[PDB]
Short mmCIF file of C-alpha atoms (C1' of nucleotides) and ligand atoms in Angstrom, two decimals:
data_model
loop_
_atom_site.label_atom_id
_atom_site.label_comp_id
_atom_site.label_asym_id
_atom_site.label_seq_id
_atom_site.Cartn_x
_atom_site.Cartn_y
_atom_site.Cartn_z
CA UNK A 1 -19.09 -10.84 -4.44
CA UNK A 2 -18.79 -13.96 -7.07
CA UNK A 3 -19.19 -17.53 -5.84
CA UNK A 4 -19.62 -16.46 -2.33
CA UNK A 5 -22.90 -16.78 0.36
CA UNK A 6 -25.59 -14.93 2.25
CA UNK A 7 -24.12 -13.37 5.00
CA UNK A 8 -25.84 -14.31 8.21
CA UNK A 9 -27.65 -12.01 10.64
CA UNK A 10 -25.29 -9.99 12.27
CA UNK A 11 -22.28 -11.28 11.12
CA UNK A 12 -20.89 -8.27 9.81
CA UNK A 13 -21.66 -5.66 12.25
CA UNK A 14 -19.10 -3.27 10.48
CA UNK A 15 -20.91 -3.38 7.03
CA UNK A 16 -21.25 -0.09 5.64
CA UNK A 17 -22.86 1.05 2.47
CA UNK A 18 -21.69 3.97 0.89
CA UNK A 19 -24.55 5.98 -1.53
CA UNK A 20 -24.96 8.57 -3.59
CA UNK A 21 -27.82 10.62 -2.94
CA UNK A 22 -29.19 11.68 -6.61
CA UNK A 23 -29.33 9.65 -8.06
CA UNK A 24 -29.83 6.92 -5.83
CA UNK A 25 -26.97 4.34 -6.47
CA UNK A 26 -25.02 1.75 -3.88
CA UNK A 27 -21.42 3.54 -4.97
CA UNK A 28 -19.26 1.13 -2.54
CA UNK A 29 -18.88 -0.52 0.82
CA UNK A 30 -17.03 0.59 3.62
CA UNK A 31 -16.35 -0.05 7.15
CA UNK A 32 -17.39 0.99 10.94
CA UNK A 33 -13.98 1.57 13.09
CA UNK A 34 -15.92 3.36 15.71
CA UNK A 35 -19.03 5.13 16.48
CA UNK A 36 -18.56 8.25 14.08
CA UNK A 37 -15.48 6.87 11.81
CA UNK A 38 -15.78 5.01 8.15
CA UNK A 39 -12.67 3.74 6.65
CA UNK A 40 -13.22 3.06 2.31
CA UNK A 41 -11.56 3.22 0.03
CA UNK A 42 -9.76 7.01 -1.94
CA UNK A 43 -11.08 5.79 -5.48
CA UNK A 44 -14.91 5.58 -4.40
CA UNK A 45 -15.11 9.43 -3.54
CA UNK A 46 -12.06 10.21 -6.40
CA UNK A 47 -10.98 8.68 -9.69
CA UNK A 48 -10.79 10.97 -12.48
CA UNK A 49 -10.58 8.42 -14.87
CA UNK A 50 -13.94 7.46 -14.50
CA UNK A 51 -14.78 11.51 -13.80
CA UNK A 52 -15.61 10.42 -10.02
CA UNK A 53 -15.30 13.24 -7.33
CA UNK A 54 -17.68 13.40 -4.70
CA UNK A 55 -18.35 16.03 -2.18
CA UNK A 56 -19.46 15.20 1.77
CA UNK A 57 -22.52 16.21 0.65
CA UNK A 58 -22.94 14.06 -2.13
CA UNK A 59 -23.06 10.66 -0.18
CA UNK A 60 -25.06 9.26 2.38
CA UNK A 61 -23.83 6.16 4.47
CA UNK A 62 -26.35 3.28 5.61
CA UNK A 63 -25.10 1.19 8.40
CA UNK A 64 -26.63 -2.46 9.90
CA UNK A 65 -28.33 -3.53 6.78
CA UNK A 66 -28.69 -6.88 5.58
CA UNK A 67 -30.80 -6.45 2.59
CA UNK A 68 -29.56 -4.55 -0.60
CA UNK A 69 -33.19 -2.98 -0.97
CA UNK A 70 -35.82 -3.11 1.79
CA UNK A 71 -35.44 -0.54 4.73
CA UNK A 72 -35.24 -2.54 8.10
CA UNK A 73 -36.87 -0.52 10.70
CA UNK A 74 -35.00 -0.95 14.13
CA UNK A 75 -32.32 -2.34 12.53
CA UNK A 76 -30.44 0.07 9.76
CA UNK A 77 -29.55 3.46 10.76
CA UNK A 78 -28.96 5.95 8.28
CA UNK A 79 -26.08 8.84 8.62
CA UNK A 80 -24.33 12.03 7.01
CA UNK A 81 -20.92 12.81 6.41
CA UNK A 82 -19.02 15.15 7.76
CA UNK A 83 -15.84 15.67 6.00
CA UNK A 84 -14.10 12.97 4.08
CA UNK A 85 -10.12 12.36 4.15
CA UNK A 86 -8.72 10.93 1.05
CA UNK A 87 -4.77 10.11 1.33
CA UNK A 88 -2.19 12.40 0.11
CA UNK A 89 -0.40 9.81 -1.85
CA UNK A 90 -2.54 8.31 -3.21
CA UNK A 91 -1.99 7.97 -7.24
CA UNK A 92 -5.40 7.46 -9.07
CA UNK A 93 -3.33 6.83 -12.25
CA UNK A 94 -0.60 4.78 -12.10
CA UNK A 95 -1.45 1.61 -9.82
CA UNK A 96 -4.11 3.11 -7.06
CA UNK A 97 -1.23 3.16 -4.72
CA UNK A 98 -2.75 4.34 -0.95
CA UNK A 99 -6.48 3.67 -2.14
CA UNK A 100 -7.94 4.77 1.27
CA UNK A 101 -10.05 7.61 2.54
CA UNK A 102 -11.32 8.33 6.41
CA UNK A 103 -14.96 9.34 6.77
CA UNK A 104 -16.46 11.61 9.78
CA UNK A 105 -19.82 11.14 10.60
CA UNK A 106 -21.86 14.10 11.65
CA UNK A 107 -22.92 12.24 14.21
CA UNK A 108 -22.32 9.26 16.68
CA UNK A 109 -24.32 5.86 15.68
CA UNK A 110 -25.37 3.90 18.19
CA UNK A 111 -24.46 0.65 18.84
CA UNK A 112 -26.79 -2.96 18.44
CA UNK A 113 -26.92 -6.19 17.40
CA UNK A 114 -25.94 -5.39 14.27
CA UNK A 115 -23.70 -2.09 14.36
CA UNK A 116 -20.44 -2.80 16.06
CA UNK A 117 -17.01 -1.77 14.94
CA UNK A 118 -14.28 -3.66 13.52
CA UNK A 119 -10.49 -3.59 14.99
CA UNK A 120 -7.86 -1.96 13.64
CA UNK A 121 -4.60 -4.02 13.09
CA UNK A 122 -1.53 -3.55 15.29
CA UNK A 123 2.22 -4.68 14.71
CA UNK A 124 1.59 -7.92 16.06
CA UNK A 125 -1.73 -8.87 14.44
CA UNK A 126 0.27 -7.53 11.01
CA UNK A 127 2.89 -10.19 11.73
CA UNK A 128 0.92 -12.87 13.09
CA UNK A 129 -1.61 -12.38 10.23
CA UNK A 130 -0.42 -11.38 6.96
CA UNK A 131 0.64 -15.11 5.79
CA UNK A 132 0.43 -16.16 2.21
CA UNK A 133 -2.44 -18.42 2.53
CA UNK A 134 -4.09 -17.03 5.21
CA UNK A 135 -7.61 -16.71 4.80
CA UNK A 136 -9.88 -13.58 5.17
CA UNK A 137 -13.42 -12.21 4.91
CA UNK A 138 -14.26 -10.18 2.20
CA UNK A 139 -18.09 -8.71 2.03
CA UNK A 140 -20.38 -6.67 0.08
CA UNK A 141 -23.71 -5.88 -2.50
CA UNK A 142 -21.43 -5.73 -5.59
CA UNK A 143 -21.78 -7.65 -8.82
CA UNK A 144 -22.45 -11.50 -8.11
CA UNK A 145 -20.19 -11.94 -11.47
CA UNK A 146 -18.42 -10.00 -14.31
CA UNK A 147 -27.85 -8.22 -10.86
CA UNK A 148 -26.51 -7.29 -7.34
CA UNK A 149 -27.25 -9.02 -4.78
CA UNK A 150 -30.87 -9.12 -2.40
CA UNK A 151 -28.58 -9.55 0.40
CA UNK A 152 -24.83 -9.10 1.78
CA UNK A 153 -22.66 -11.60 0.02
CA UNK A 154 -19.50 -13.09 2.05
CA UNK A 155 -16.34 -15.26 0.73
CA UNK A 156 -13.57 -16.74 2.47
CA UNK A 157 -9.60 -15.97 0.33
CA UNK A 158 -6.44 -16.70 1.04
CA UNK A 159 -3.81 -14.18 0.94
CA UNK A 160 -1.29 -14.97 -2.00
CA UNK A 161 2.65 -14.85 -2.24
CA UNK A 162 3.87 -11.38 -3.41
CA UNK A 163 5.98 -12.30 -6.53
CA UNK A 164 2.50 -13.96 -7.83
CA UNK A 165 0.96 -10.99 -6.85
CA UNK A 166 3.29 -9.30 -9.18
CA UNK A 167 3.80 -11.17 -11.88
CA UNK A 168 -0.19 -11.70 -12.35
CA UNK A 169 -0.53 -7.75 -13.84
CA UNK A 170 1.36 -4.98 -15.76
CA UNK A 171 0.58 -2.84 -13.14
CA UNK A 172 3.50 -1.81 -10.58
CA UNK A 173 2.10 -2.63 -7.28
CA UNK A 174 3.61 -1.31 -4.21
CA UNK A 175 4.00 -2.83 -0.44
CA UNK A 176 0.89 -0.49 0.46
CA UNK A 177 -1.59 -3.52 -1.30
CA UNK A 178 -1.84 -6.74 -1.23
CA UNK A 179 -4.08 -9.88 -3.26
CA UNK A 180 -5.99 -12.02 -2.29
CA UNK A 181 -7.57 -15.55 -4.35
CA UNK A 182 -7.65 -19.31 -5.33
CA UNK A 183 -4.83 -20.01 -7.76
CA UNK A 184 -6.18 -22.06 -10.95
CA UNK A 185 -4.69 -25.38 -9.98
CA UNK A 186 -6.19 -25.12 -6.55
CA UNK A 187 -9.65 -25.68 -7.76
CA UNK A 188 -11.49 -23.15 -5.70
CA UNK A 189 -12.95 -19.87 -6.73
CA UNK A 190 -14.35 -16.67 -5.22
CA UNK A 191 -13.38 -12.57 -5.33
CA UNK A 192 -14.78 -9.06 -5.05
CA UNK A 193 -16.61 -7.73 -7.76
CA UNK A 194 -18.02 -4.22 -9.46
CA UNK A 195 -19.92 -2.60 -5.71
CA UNK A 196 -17.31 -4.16 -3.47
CA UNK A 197 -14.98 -1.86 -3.47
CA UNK A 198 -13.51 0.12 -0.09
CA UNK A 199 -15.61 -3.00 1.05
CA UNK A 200 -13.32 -4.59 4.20
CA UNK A 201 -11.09 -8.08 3.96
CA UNK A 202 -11.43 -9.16 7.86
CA UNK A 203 -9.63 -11.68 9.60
CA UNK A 204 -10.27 -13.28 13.03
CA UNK A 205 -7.52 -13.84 15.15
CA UNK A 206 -6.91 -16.85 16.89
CA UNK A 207 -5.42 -15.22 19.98
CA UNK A 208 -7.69 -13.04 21.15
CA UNK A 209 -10.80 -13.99 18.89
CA UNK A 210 -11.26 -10.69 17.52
CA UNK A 211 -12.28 -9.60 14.00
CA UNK A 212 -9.64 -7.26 12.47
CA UNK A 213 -9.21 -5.39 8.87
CA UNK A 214 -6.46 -5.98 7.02
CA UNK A 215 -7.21 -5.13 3.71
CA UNK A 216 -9.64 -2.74 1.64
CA UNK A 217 -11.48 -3.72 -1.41
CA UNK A 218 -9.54 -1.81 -3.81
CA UNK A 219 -9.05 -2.83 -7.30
CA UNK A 220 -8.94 -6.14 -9.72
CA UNK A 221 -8.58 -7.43 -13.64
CA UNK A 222 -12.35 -8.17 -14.38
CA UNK A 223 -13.31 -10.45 -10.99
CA UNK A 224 -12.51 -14.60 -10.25
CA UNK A 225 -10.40 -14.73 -13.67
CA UNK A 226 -7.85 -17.26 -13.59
CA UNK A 227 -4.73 -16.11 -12.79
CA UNK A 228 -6.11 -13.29 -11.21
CA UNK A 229 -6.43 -12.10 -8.32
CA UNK A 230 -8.02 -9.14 -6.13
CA UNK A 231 -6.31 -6.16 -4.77
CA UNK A 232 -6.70 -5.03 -1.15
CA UNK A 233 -5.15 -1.50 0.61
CA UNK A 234 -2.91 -2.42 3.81
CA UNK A 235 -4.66 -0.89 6.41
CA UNK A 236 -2.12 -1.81 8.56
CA UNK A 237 0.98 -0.27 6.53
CA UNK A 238 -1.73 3.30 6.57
CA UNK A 239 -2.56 3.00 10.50
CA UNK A 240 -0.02 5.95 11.11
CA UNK A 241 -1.58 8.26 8.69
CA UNK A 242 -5.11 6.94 10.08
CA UNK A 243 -4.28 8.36 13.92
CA UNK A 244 -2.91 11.47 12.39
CA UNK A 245 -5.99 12.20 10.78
CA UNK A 246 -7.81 10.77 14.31
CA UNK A 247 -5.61 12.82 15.88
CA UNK A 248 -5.81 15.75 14.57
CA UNK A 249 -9.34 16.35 13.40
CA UNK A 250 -11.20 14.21 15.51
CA UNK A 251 -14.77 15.63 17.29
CA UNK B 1 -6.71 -6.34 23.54
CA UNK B 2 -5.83 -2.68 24.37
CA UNK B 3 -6.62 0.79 23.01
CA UNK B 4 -4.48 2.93 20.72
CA UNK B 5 -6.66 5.97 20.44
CA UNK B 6 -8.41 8.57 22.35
CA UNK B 7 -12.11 8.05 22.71
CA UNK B 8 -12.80 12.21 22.60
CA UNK B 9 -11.08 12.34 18.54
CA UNK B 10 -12.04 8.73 17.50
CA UNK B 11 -15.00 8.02 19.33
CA UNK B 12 -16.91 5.22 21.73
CA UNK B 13 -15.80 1.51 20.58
CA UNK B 14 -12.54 0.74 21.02
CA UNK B 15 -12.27 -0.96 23.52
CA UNK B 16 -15.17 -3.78 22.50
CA UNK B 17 -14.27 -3.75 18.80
CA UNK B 18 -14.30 -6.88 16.49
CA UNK B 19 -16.35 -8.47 19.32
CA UNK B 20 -19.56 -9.64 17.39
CA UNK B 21 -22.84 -9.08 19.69
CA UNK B 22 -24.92 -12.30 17.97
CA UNK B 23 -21.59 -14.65 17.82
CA UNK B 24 -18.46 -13.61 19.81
CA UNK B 25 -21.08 -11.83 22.76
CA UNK B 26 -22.93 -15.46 22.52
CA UNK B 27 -20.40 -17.94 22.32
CA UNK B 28 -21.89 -19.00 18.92
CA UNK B 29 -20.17 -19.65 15.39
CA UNK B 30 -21.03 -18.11 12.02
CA UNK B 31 -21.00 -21.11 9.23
CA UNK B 32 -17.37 -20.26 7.69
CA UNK B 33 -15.32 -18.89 10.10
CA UNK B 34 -13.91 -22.49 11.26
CA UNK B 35 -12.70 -22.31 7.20
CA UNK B 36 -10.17 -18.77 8.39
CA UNK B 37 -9.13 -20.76 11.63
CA UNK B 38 -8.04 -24.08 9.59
CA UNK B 39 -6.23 -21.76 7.05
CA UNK B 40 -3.82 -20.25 9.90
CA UNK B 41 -2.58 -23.78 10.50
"C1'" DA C 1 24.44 -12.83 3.05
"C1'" DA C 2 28.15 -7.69 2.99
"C1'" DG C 3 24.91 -4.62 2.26
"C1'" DT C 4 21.47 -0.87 -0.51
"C1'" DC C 5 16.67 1.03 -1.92
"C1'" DC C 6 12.08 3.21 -0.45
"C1'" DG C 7 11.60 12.66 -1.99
"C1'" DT C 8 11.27 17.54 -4.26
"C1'" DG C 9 7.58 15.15 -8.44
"C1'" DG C 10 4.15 12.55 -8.12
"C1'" DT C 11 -2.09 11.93 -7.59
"C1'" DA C 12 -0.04 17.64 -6.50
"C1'" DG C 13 2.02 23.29 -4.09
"C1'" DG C 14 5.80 25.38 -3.42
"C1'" DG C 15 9.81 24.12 -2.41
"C1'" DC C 16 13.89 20.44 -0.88
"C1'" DA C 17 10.53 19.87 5.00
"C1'" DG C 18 6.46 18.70 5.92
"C1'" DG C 19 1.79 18.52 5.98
"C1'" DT C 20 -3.67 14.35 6.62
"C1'" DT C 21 2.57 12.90 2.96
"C1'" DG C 22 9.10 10.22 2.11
"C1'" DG C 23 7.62 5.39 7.07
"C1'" DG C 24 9.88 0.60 7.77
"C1'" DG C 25 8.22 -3.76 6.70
"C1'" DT C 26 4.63 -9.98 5.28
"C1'" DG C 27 10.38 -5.52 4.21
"C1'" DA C 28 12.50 -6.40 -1.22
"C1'" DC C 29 16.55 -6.90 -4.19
"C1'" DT C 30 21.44 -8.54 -4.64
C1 4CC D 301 -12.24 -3.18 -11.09
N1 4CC D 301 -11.57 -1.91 -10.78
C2 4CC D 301 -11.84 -0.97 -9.84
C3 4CC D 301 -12.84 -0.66 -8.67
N2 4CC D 301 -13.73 -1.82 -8.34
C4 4CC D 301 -13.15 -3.16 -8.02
C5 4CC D 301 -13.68 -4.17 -8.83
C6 4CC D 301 -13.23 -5.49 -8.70
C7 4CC D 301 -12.27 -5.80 -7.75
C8 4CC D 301 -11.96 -7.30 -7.80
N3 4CC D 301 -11.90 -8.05 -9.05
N4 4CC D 301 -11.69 -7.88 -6.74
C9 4CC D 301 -11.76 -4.80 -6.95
C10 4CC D 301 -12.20 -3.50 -7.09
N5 4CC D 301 -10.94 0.04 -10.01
C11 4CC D 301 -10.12 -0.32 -11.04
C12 4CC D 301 -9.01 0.27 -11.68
C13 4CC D 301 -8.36 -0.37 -12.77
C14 4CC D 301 -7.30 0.75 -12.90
O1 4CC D 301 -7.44 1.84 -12.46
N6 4CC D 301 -6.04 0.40 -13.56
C15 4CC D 301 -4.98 1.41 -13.64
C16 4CC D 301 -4.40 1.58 -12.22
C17 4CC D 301 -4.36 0.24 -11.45
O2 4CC D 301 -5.40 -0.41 -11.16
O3 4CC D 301 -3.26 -0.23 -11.08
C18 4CC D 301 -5.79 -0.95 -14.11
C19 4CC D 301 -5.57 -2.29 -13.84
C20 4CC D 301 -5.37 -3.17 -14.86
C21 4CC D 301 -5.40 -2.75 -16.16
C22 4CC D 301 -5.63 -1.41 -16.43
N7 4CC D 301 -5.83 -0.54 -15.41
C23 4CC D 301 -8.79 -1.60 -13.21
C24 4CC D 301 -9.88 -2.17 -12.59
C25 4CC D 301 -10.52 -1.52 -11.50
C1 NAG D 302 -9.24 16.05 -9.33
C2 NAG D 302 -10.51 16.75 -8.93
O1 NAG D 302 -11.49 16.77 -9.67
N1 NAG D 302 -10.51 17.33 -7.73
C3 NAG D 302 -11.33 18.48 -7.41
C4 NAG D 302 -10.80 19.23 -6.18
O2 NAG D 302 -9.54 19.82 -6.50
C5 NAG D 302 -11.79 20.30 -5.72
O3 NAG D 302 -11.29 20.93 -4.55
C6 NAG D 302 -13.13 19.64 -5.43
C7 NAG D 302 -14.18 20.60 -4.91
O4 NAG D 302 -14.57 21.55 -5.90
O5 NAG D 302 -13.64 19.06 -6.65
C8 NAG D 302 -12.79 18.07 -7.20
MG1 MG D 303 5.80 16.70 -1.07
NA1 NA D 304 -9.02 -14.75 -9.28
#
DNA sequence: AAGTCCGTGGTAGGGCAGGTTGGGGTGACT
């Protein structure tokens, strides 16, 4: 995260890291929708560009933590994978259209003060939400600019128009993203960095004072360049193929 | 708030999800939240 | 603002449906 803060105790309770095994490496964040399901994002388990394809196997998920390195008895639990779902459409080439996998745990976590799941968007939240300037919660151990982090970093970004969104890259986005990001002439600054990614953007809604993700971390042109801005998967927009996978392969 | 999914494929959690035990549970504030609030005005 | 676009390959098979996938929305474009 660049020019964001410490996260506070327990403020996060949905903060997931996502590791490879061997070697040991923080490959991504990710987030807790239940007590056995991890939503992140497709191109942290597969992007051929970067020869990444990882196996269940592979990865190991550490949930509760608050600092990057130390082990916090009582506090962090650690857990396996079952099997991962990646996306059918999702296009690793072109524009990371449908960046989003599901992850099984092999087993239940238990709940605390600092495991809890996040919501999951519905129709209304989508509409009552998704605003250009609208400001969510973005969160992870990723690169503090373009050193990670001793402990979770969080920033606050508003939600930008679409036809800046598009004119701001070559790339052909699609209505299954969205960005998020100061413009340069409003002074601010702050974005997702290099670790980040399938990391959650959250927002809190006023009505029922819940925490909901809208957004994955998914992709960006370096991180906090002017002009730019970050790219997040619309978990709501993929909440159909999410209960079909629920659905159908669930315990 | 109401649930979407069953509990037996998608687990325990629904139901108290986005509910934060050390803020929401408490009736305290984290220190930038109020900044998400002010934007949806 | 009448409407029209969002599947047969592509990220990719065997096929023109549907599956974990071509829905409908922050709809977008005219
Ligand atoms: C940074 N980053 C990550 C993952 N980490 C990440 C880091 C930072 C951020 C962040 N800055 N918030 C969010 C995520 N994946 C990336 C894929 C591309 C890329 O694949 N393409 C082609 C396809 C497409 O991306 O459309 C692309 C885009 C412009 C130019 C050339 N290529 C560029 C950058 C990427
Ligand atoms: C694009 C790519 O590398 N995908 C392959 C996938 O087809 C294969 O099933 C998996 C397990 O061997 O390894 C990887
Ligand atoms: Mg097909
Ligand atoms: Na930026």
């Amino acid at each position: 995260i660049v020019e964001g803060s410490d996260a506070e105790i327990g403020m996060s309770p949905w903060q997931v890291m996502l590791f490879r095994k061997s070697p040991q490496e923080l490959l991504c964040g990710a987030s807790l929708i239940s007590d056995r399901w991890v939503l992140t994002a497709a191109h942290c388990l597969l992007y051929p560009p970067w020869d990444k394809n990882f196996t269940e196997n592979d990865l190991l998920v550490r949930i509760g933590k608050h600092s990057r390195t130390r082990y916090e008895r009582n506090i962090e639990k650690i857990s396996m994978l079952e099997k991962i779902y990646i996306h059918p459409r999702y296009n690793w080439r072109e524009n990371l259209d449908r960046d989003i996998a599901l992850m099984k745990l092999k087993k239940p976590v238990a709940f605390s003060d600092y495991i809890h799941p996040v919501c999951l968007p519905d129709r209304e939240t989508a509409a009552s939400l998704l605003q250009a300037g609208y400001k969510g919660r973005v969160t992870g151990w990723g690169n503090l600019k373009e050193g990670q982090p001793s402990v979770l970093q969080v920033v606050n970004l508003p939600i930008v128009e679409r036809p800046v969104c598009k004119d701001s890259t070559r790339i052909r986005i699609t209505d299954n993203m969205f960005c998020a990001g100061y413009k340069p002439d409003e002074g601010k600054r702050g974005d997702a960095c290099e670790g980040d990614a399938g990391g959650p953007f959250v927002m809190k809604s006023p009505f029922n004072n819940r925490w909901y993700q809208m957004g994955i971390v998914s992709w960006g042109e370096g991180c906090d360049r002017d002009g730019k801005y970050g790219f997040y998967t619309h978990v709501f927009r993929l909440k159909k193929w999410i209960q079909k996978v629920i659905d159908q392969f669930g315990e | 708030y109401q649930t979407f999914f069953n509990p037996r494929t998608f687990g325990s959690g629904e139901a108290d999800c986005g509910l934060r035990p050390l803020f929401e549970k408490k009736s305290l504030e984290d220190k930038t939240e109020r900044e998400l609030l002010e934007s949806y005005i």
